Write a protein that binds this ligand. Structure first.
Ligand SMILES: *[C@@H]1O[C@H](CO)[C@@H](O[C@@H]2O[C@H](CO)[C@@H](O)[C@H](O)[C@H]2NC(C)=O)[C@H](O)[C@H]1NC(C)=O
Ligand SMILES: *[C@@H]1O[C@H](CO)[C@@H](O[C@@H]2O[C@H](CO)[C@@H](O)[C@H](O)[C@H]2NC(C)=O)[C@H](O)[C@H]1NC(C)=O
Ligand SMILES: *[C@@H]1O[C@H](CO)[C@@H](O[C@@H]2O[C@H](CO)[C@@H](O)[C@H](O)[C@H]2NC(C)=O)[C@H](O)[C@H]1NC(C)=O
Ligand SMILES: *[C@@H]1O[C@H](CO)[C@@H](O[C@@H]2O[C@H](CO)[C@@H](O)[C@H](O)[C@H]2NC(C)=O)[C@H](O)[C@H]1NC(C)=O
Ligand SMILES: *[C@@H]1O[C@H](CO)[C@@H](O[C@@H]2O[C@H](CO)[C@@H](O)[C@H](O)[C@H]2NC(C)=O)[C@H](O)[C@H]1NC(C)=O
Ligand SMILES: *[C@@H]1O[C@H](CO)[C@@H](O[C@@H]2O[C@H](CO)[C@@H](O)[C@H](O)[C@H]2NC(C)=O)[C@H](O)[C@H]1NC(C)=O
Ligand SMILES: *[C@@H]1O[C@H](CO[C@H]2O[C@@H](C)[C@@H](O)[C@@H](O)[C@@H]2O)[C@@H](O)[C@H](O)[C@H]1NC(C)=O
Ligand SMILES: *[C@@H]1O[C@H](CO[C@H]2O[C@@H](C)[C@@H](O)[C@@H](O)[C@@H]2O)[C@@H](O)[C@H](O)[C@H]1NC(C)=O
Ligand SMILES: *C(=N)[C@@H]1CCCN1C(=O)CN[C@@]12C[C@@H]3C[C@@H](C[C@@](O)(C3)C1)C2
Ligand SMILES: *C(=N)[C@@H]1CCCN1C(=O)CN[C@@]12C[C@@H]3C[C@@H](C[C@@](O)(C3)C1)C2
Ligand SMILES: *[C@@H]1O[C@H](CO)[C@@H](O)[C@H](O)[C@H]1NC(C)=O
Ligand SMILES: *[C@@H]1O[C@H](CO)[C@@H](O)[C@H](O)[C@H]1NC(C)=O
Ligand SMILES: *[C@@H]1O[C@H](CO)[C@@H](O)[C@H](O)[C@H]1NC(C)=O
Ligand SMILES: *[C@@H]1O[C@H](CO)[C@@H](O)[C@H](O)[C@H]1NC(C)=O
Ligand SMILES: *[C@@H]1O[C@H](CO)[C@@H](O)[C@H](O)[C@H]1NC(C)=O
Lengths: 729, 729
């Protein structure tokens, strides 16, 4: 073989690009799609298109447009520019509204600069936005806004947006507002961070800045004072008729008010029914309220007969949080993924005023998500097919007969496609399937009326062609047996892999709770280069604490982070040695964030198994990490709760054992998530016991170390280190 | 040769220790010396001693005594403990006073904890101290203190202590107090930092600290708002318990008040006469006032006819600041080192009443310091002998005939001793000579009347005998010629140096203005190990900008930092590389602080001479560094002054050129002097152009990276780097 390999530059420079097919449904029949910077509108049924917006219409704009969004009634388009990243989901931007009917920009009563969030109402063209931490509503794009809150205060009161920890760990979003289905009501959360301590770090900025700035962010570490939260609902239809519309508060249940708690889910059921889930700071107890608008008092009432309790005896509640309900049209019943009696997550069906639900799925596998619900059918994704926890398929269950379950995706192309996600049109008339492995991504459009394939949207044949000329690595997905339990693993194997030979191995680790690093997804990444060009086997292993396989496995690390998930990685490497194709003198380990923690814990174990390793942005001590995430698994760091284990599971206390390995420690200085502090303490502890190691900081890079130049620099730096670790004398 | 070499462990663990002999003169006849933790008093003429304080008198004190300070009359001893370092000179401590007559500790009116500075009067046993930024005076150790100032405010108003930049760059001390010769008056400065911006950086502290703290320090970077200063004198003989002490202000001259200025020298002339020097922010103009106490006014008058102006047309004034005056017994005249018309630093004799001074020394060499003055002789150290700029000897000059100059140290032991410093008794009746190279240090006692060598105090006999069993490197001091000028260099040469072998070479650079790295001093440092064990030649070179050779050389870099002194290093290495015993494929460079800057500029020069280098806490951009030092050499970074060269002289601009070298960049995160910022911006510029390099941060280390564990760690890491750089294919 004399084909070129997949090299480091190929990865860093994106030589071989995955084609996507990102569409946005605007109705039950139509979707939008970007073709050569034009925006086309497509008829789902026939596949014909038209130009919705010519690529030329905003040359005279004066600003580089970042993104757009169309009002649901098709009458307006929201143009977003001056985009400035904040945290994982948050950012600020400017906005203009373009009137698609007058084919003109709106120049009156403009959305202000430095707007934090904006969203159309779900019907029509109402807008709600957050600016300087307060909520505003526009009934009409050209008309003046109604202010909803006056309490907004930078770093202190957040109305309709999350603070740092709620954004990262609770809502996976910045926005904390929720329009009712037809846009009458605007629900929102308000966060009070008054007593939450600040993380403080330097940001150096462009070379031209003389004095570095100090970034200060309300951020509760483990056991510290959390933000408090309140929930309100305003009737936006009353705005133009009243001076100052009343925000009606819906208070948390008594069982929550006794202590620290979180708002963890908001979901509208009908025009006049909203559901809330609350979670105790000790995250093994949650309560759902279901609240009705009382038309004669203007108030919101949550009948205790409608309150649902979700708890856990073995761990926390939910995968990362209690799951969302999906309500039937009339809002009198709902479906919800919950852990069954055997510890497997399955769909349960509830009447809103009956406490016991009925399971509609069951088995030793898990429902990943409920994707759509019609009067006749519920569609969901599971890992049922072939008992593969790392696969994903779309299924359709008949609501009038639960024994009738069709797999909609399983056999479409079983060799090429074992990992699916889906996108339904507005009333589930059509669906896009997105296959993402083990072969090249494949996007297809389907019609729900008959589940017939309409057309291939994108098959990546261009890439496939290019990839023929390349000595691509292969992926093996399998399992090994420990104490009568299956534990899955994957291996990125060099091309022409020969079992008779001994190979350097890199163990690519994450291993946080409910993580899954062994799966059927096709990836073009650093591992691809290492296996293809450097002939390294890159392995990953889902041990105790890993997800999608039941609570027996997932909750094994409950209150005990830094134990089983760490030792199971070490054991994995041992088992790979036994397999006979691994050079046991050349075993390396690496990971990012939770993977950095695990890597460091493994390198400090004294096991003798690993020659070297790389921790990027590691956690080093659970008390440095945020409350919501950490406490979920570890409880509170107090003598009466779990302090002993918090203190026993630090990287620093293993500093002496790093004498036996080669270590590379890397961290962005402006990491708002895993604070530079965490590596600063590892390095100090290593210096303190006389251990030599390698280090790299990335000035002004955050958790992602994702700026174009830093991304290339870090993977270059890590490649040299691995190659040095591995090469033969 | 079966002998051990001088290893890295020997340097790090201090296996071979230089013996010292640190005495304190208490009179014209006697000195104190700490021996076996006992304090002894020595008669200088005979050599006999008595015990002044037994090593056990404080056995039940309950604290470790950091240090001691005996009152000038011998009646009291100030005990220092709870020492907590601040910057280069500043610290706080607790103090107790022990009465030597009563043989007991004083327990009433104790000096407060967290005392910032304390000092005895020059005669007797009065005390002045600073606490919470205010000045206090005790007439007697057991009596209540009088409060002198009431304006002290942390980080804002400093009475009798310096702020950050005055401590580091002006006085090389924390104290800003000056007793009159007999203790009647206490002079002091007051610093006001209200509008000085703060440098801010993280401090991580011990592992147990959950949130890092932010350290905030008033620190003016180049061009920023400086502290303002006032000067005051208070009579300590007329203090009352009833009324608030009165301080008399001496205002700066009009020529200073017109703009930003500094107080740069305070020197008492008589019991009732004080001199002060002031320096313009543009540091090429200074003025001395000489101020007489007026008994009927109770005021201090500085006659214009007694002003002395000192300026420079080619650079700044003085080496690092205008030199100190040395007044005669009547205070009517004084001696002062100033740059002569040839640009060489020599002793000028001034009358307080007359504008023209008279040079009493001349020649192409320089006076280092005036050391002692009698009515018959002035004693000084110069580098006159053998025309060697890097040697130092003690001379006396006859005041009645300037042609009569006698060298007192030159011929004592020319082979071992070419570098001296001196300590004189109270009326210069006796002097101690401290030889520090080229051989092992040698301390001798002498009497002034006929310059008799009385006795050897310490000859390092023991060390000599240990060193005979080690393969020690030698030192070559020599010169090269550039455009007709001698420039000196030194080489630390491996044992058994062979002019026919080719050795790798490390350029140890500092090269700041007025620096000297080529000298006759004996040193046991990192270079010693590199030469003795690794057989690396370690060279240093004094090019343009270097000190003690006249202003033509020293002022060459005026307004032009990062030019000629960087060029001259490259040129020296170029010349070394053409010598027969230097391997031109293995030339490295390293330096700390100003040396880190120069090392970085050299590596980024594109010269191709250097294979690798190490920068420790480098400056990278002159606008990041402090006003007093930077502006001395650079002027102001404004478009109408010197901004273009501030911007042309950054390390960052040369990032591209690092592509062809190996670079290790190291910095302490708690460096208050050269901020971590400076390295953060270097790394970021290197990342931006795709250059790989090596880095190490030291968590919570300041500029010295001097904690015992960090110090071992940095040198271990640098040793690995140099060894790898010099390892042969
Ligand atoms: C709209 O109503 C709210 C609620 O009463 C007003 O906000 C209050 O204003 C007073 C006085 O300014 C404060 O003391 C209260 O704490 C505020 N309450 C809340 C819940 O924020 C608001 O000012 C009204 N807006 C207008 C324009 O009248
Ligand atoms: C959206 O839903 C809301 C809430 O049910 C509707 O508002 C109610 O409409 C009925 C008319 O059938 C009135 O009797 C009530 O007074 C309304 N209640 C409130 C709180 O406004 C609203 O009409 C619906 N909007 C649309 C466009 O259909
Ligand atoms: C939620 O988690 C906590 C901690 O695991 C549980 O509290 C423990 O409960 C048992 C049984 O009452 C006690 O013996 C322990 O002392 C408790 N530990 C504490 C308070 O730290 C709590 O019971 C859990 N809730 C559920 C439903 O399992
Ligand atoms: C220290 O300096 C500041 C100015 O840098 C002085 O504050 C000024 O004082 C005058 C008179 O009191 C006011 O009119 C100004 O408005 C003040 N300026 C600022 C910026 O605050 C302060 O008085 C000085 N302190 C001492 C003790 O001398
Ligand atoms: C220290 O010097 C001061 C200043 O000259 C002496 O104080 C003066 O002494 C004279 C002569 O006795 C008095 O008439 C003056 O009134 C004093 N001046 C002041 C300003 O107080 C003082 O005597 C000297 N101290 C010692 C211990 O000798
Ligand atoms: C102190 O230094 C400054 C800066 O070099 C000198 O000011 C310069 O003087 C010349 C001639 O008078 C002017 O043409 C320049 O424009 C000035 N430069 C600046 C930046 O102002 C000043 O003359 C020096 N003082 C002495 C005594 O030499
Ligand atoms: C797409 O075409 C629509 C025309 O309807 C006919 O399309 C023919 C191709 C054929 O299949 C007939 O059966 C259909 O009745 C038209 O109404 C839509 O406006 C077009 N949509 C877009 C986005 O261009
Ligand atoms: C130091 O010596 C003094 C003792 O007298 C000396 O006289 C010399 C002339 C010579 O003959 C010596 O042998 C004698 O010892 C005495 O006054 C000092 O107090 C002594 N001790 C000290 C200063 O600690
Ligand atoms: C690194 N992985 C850090 C340290 C341990 C927790 N981790 C987080 O960033 C936690 N936040 C999330 C939780 C889940 C899974 C990951 C993506 C996220 O969006 C959802 C946020 C990490
Ligand atoms: C490193 N050398 C830094 C950056 C450039 C100047 N430098 C300083 O620390 C300046 N301060 C002094 C100035 C002189 C020489 C050195 C010792 C000192 O006490 C007197 C303080 C450095
Ligand atoms: C605009 O659209 C046309 C296709 O109709 C295409 O040729 C052109 O490249 C597009 N321009 C940009 C800037 O995307
Ligand atoms: C936003 O910023 C610019 C000034 O930088 C201004 O001209 C523009 O009008 C602003 N937009 C709005 C909506 O205020
Ligand atoms: C936020 O909480 C603090 C107490 O922590 C309180 O004083 C303040 O009023 C609150 N602000 C609100 C709810 O707007
Ligand atoms: C210094 O600190 C100790 C211990 O807290 C205290 O008892 C003592 O009184 C302090 N000294 C003075 C002079 O205040
Ligand atoms: C001295 O001055 C200070 C501050 O101005 C004042 O508070 C104090 O009362 C004064 N004391 C006397 C005795 O005048």
């Amino acid at each position: 073989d004399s084909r070129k390999t997949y090299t480091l530059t190929d990865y860093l420079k994106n030589t071989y690009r995955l084609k996507l097919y990102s569409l946005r449904w605007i109705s039950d029949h139509e979707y939008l799609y970007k073709q050569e910077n034009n925006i086309l509108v497509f008829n789902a049924e026939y596949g014909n298109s038209s130009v919705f917006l010519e690529n030329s219409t905003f040359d005279e704009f004066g600003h580089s447009i970042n993104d757009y969004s169309i009002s649901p009634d098709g009458q307006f388009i929201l143009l977003e520019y001056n985009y400035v990243k904040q945290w994982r989901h948050s950012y600020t931007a400017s906005y203009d509204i373009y009137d698609l009917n007058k084919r003109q920009l709106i120049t009156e009563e403009r959305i202000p600069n430095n707007t934090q969030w904006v969203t159309w109402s779900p019907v029509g063209h109402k807008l709600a936005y957050v600016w300087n931490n307060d909520i505003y509503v526009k009934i009409e794009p050209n008309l003046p806004s109604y202010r909803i809150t006056w309490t907004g205060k930078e770093d202190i009161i957040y109305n309709g947006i999350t603070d740092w920890v709620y954004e990262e760990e609770v809502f996976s979003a910045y926005s904390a507002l929720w329009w009712s289905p037809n846009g009458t009501f605007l629900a929102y959360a308000q966060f009070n961070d008054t007593e939450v301590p600040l993380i403080e770090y330097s940001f150096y900025s462009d070379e031209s800045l003389q004095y570095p700035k100090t970034v200060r962010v309300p951020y509760p570490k483990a056991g510290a004072v959390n933000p408090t939260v309140k929930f309100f609902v305003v009737n936006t239809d009353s705005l133009s008729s009243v001076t100052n519309a009343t925000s009606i508060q819906i208070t948390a249940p008594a069982s929550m008010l006794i202590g620290d708690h979180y708002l963890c889910d908001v979901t509208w059921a009908t025009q006049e029914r909203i559901s809330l889930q609350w979670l105790r700071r000790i995250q093994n107890y949650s309560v759902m309220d279901i609240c009705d608008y009382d038309e004669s008092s203007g108030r919101w009432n949550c009948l205790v007969a409608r309150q649902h309790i979700e708890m856990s005896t073995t761990g926390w509640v939910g995968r990362f949080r209690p799951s969302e309900p999906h309500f039937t049209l009339d809002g009198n019943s709902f479906y919800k993924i919950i852990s069954n009696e055997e510890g497997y997550r399955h769909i349960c069906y509830f009447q809103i005023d009956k406490k016991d639900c009925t399971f509609i799925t069951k088995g030793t596998w898990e429902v990943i998500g409920i994707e759509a619900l019609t009067s006749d059918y519920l569609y969901y994704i599971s890992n049922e097919y072939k008992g593969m926890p790392g696969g994903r398929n779309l299924y359709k269950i008949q609501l009038s007969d639960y024994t009738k379950v069709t797999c909609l995706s399983c056999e479409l192309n079983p060799e090429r496609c074992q990992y699916y996600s889906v996108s339904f049109s507005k009333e589930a008339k059509y669906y896009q399937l997105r296959c993402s492995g083990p072969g090249l991504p494949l996007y297809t459009l389907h019609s729900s009326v008959n589940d017939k394939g309409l057309r291939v949207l994108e098959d990546n044949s261009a890439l496939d062609k290019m990839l023929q000329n390349v000595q691509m690595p292969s992926k093996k997905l399998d399992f090994i047996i420990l104490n009568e339990t299956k534990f899955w693993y994957q291996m990125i194997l060099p091309p022409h892999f020969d079992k008779s030979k001994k190979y350097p191995l890199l163990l690519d680790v994450y291993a946080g709770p409910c993580s899954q690093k062994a799966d059927t997804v096709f990836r073009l990444n650093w591992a691809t280069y290492l296996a293809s060009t450097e002939n390294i086997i890159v392995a990953s292993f889902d041990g105790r604490g890993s997800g999608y396989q039941g609570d027996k496995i997932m909750h094994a690390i409950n209150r005990r982070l830094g134990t089983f998930e760490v030792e199971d990685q070490i054991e994995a490497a041992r088992q790979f040695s036994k397999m006979g194709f691994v050079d046991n003198k050349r075993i390396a380990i690496w990971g990012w964030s939770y993977g950095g923690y695990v890597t460091s814990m493994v390198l400090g174990s004294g096991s003798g198994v690993f020659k070297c390793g790389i921790a990027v942005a590691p956690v080093s001590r659970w008390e440095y990490y945020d409350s919501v995430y950490t406490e979920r698994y570890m409880g509170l760091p107090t003598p009466e709760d779990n302090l002993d284990h918090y203190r026993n599971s630090t990287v620093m206390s293993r500093a002496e054992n790093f004498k036996q390995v080669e270590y590379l420690l890397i961290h962005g200085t402006a990491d708002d998530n895993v604070h530079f502090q965490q590596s600063a303490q590892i390095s100090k502890a290593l210096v303190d016991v006389g251990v030599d190691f390698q280090a790299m900081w990335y000035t002004d890079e955050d958790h992602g170390i994702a700026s174009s130049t830093a991304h290339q620099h870090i993977y270059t730096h890590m490649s040299h280190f691995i190659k040095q670790c591995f090469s033969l004398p």
